[PDB]
Amino acid sequence: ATYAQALQSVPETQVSQLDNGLRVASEQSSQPTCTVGVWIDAGSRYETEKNNGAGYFVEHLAFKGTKNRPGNALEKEVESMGAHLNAYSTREHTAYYIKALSKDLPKAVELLADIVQNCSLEDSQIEKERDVILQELQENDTSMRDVVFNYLHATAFQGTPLAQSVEGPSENVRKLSRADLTEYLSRHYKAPRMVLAAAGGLEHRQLLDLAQKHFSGLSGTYDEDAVPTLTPCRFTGSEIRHREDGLPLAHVAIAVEGPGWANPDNVALQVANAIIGHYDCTYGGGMHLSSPLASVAVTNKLCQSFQTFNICYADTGLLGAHFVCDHMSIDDMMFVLQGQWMRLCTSATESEVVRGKNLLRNALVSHLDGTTPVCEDIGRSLLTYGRRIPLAEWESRIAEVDARVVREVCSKYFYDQCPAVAGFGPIEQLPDYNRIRSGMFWLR
Amino acid sequence: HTDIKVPDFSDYRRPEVLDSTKSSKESSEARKGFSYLITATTTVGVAY
Amino acid sequence: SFPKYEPSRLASLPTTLDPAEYDISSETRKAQAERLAIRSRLKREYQLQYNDPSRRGVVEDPAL
Amino acid sequence: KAVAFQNPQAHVIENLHAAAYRNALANSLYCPDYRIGKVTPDELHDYVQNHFTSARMALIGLGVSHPVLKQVAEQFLNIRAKAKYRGGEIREQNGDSLVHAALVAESAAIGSAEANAFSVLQHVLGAGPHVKRGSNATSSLYQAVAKGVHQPFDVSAFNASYSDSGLFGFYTISQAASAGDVIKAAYNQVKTIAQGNLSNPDVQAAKNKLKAGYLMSVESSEGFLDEVGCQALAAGSYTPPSTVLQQIDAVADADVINAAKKFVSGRKSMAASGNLGHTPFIDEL
Amino acid sequence: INIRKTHPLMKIVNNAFIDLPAPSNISSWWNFGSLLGICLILQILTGLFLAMHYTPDTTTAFSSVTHICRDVNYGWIIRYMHANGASMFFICLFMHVGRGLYYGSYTFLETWNIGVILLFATMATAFMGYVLPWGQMSFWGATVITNLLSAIPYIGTNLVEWIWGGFSVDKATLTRFFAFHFIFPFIIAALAMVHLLFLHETGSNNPTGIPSDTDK
Amino acid sequence: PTLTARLYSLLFRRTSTFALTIVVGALFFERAFDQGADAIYEHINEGKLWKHIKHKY
Ligand code: HEM
């Protein structure tokens, strides 16, 4: 019992500041399994046109040999102690992390330091990995949901560098030199911006001392003060439609403005997307789901799937919906989705907000379990928010939100906004832009 | 497929939205109000 | 706190709030280095043909 | 059924299980192709009244207290074979430019040090790539075929443990007209491993691999739930994971080479699928 | 889902006037169908108020039209609007005919036949309404055109005696023409719906004549 | 331009508020515009109508 009192039984993340400027943070939790990770603010947003896709290429060549343990000895030690190496990169973040055991922590931090600060590139490496990325683009031209997200960011952040792709275009990939790689490595693998964070059964002193013995000596000064700095860009609102009829299903992504990070409208719109949420076509209780979009869509056989969702970047983002449906069903699914949005805008009752609170709490707690997602929580917390936000804070911000504030926020950020439609597939029936906009503001 | 870039609409954009670096939140109400005010004056004339 | 200083054909945009001066890429460092080099060489040619004690006439700028 | 089986590996594993045993373990999880729209609820009633008895059930609680659980169990829940090996193969000519070949003998049931020997053996042989975009410096099968064939391929070992029987083997994805080389190279590697050419630090490395995998299946409460429940039904007695690892690394390569010697000694079964123009049958091996 | 595709009136209207897939490059000349429709319903309205203020007899006709143009207020603009609305009707009508001849839209066969039936109907309506004011030009145009109908031998003479209602242009001819100038535009409106029916079935026409079913 | 933005925030956000806005606007401009139109029509003659010489008799 006493769910709030049980939420006070959650440990706190120690935050400390290595003398290079490096943010280190640890959550000593109650398990023999540890996750140690590095989160780096070097996405794709910090790039030129000619450095497009350099970061993806770096992440490929992050694990392929260094000046210290050349060639494959990195991987050999990983498979020696049975380490579990993993990495990902987004448009705004880039992370390398390691799932391992409570006792190999000095050797794992040695591995991670040799990944980051001593990455070295070679000619056989650059040629072979250029061939590898040509294989990966040519075999992920057909990853359809990825193509839809590419189109959505490209059409909603036109002109600004946020519309660049994570891999870069092909004609910036097949001609990169090592010099531009070294420039990117030099200009974005810097000490103060990045976070070393561990989550598991280990004390903060051990982590601080190992970071002192290895991360003393990466960086701290730029190449003649060529400081990368954010620009709060502009959300255009448009549609790009890729008519390609030889495909079985059609994908639609509809999106509007992102609220940002530090505003609490972040949390309230996450409550609205808890109400709307996601349906996939493989459920039980299909005729009786509480989510009204999925209830109408199942009973009238509209869509294969939807996820109705949030994405935030620095002072911006895409608040939106994705749905996949058959080429003779797009219009009515579209109509019911705008109907759900406007019903939340003007006629938000109380019980549906209570259901949103239940869904958001359960999704938040279920997302924050397992050592590695909690370490990713801490990494994105100390990057964006600049602190590990506690979950009693999330309890406070949930309890400080009722039906009135929800319909206020959705009247602000949805009602008669200029959307962005990225449609891919057989979408000749997908309605024209003016009737989407006329479906936004509704007279009735 | 990643080489899908938009051709730039700098010939067509409004003077508030020619800046591809300033945010378009505080530029929204005036632009939408001006379009809707032209629709309103049209509706006034038709109703007369 | 401020409507961010719309420019004109008369009101110059001052040195401070560009805001292009804070996105220093390596290309701007390269351009500022070469621009200083051009100004260096032109002041060198000018100063040597400016301080000649035998030089009676004017220095005869090709720019003008 | 269509949504689940759109991954090829579900069809491959199911055709291997339909090739595995001669009996009820060859039945799918999924409904078969023709029964969709033919079965009645009376089998469902009878199936619940003869298999969902109180004598067959494990109730696990996390986040609860003990006596609440015990009382609601005592108020509501007081309401009341021997599969044989088969031998053979199943070929699934389908044509996706991806030869999927799983090659499996019969190994051991759950809960034996023999089964632990098979597990440390398959981590010696090959498993999931521990490095993202990796090159598998330790998976010796991948070593032998990367020595052999310079193509897109992927080789991984395979354990299907059961309460009574078990399956050991491996699983290979390759191109169409290059699969015979891959299967022969990997099988000659398994031969020269089962000869006895397997060393002690490799044994310790695989011990640490299996210890890592077993501690990392039970990180969250879900895998913890999975382990505890499958134990408490499979055995009726909880065991801490630390002493499980102690019982694991108590073994040596004695049982490992004995069990790999059983596998090369074992009468093979297999399942292949895809464009199979150059596929070894059994006899080419 | 949506009342706009469940309610059966709105099924026909939503597949006629809302979600109608016209091609994308319509020029100025395809407005004239809607203009003919609007001219027609304005004709019907102005004629209705005219029919409320009019006494049709050869003794009384010009007296009554004068009475409308003086005493019943705004009836002067009702009269003038009916006359010049017939004028703008025929200007828009020859533009619509000329468009259909010009851009090769005359391939749509039974639409085009329905068109020619509509053209004769408008000509008959305009003729009879122009008889109606019962003035000098009215009278002699009437006598000329009726004996032009009598030019056909052996039945057409008796046919003209029949459509007279008399042996000359009499009061009976005046009320026959009043009744038909009333009742024909309703037939024109219904056949306009038939014209639009066949057009929605067969498909519209772009300016370039290209089969334009890719850019609706 | 914010005067048009605050006009959007006051009178163009809601539907029935927009309708009542154009009601009040059409009525007041109807009154004042008919006054101005009759003023222009008398200004363009100033000596020809019946009203001024009917009251100066
Ligand atoms: C069914 C609806 C209509 C009614 C009830 C109607 C009624 C009348 C009446 C009472 C008149 C005599 C008024 C006058 O001539 O000063 C008239 C005149 C006339 N009508 Fe119609 N009319 C109708 C539709 C049309 C249509 C569709 C046309 C063709 C566009 C048309 C063409 C004329 C013409 C040309 C005149 C003679 C105008 C004149 O000489 O002043 N009418 N109509």
Ligand code: HEM
């Ligand atoms: C009673 C008068 C008539 C009316 C009210 C009328 C009305 C219309 C309307 C509303 C359209 C559709 C316009 C569009 O889609 O842009 C149309 C189309 C058409 N009409 Fe008529 N019509 C009339 C007489 C005629 C006549 C006499 C002809 C010639 C025989 C004709 C031939 C056509 C053709 C060919 C089209 C197709 C336009 C295209 O897609 O190019 N109509 N009409």
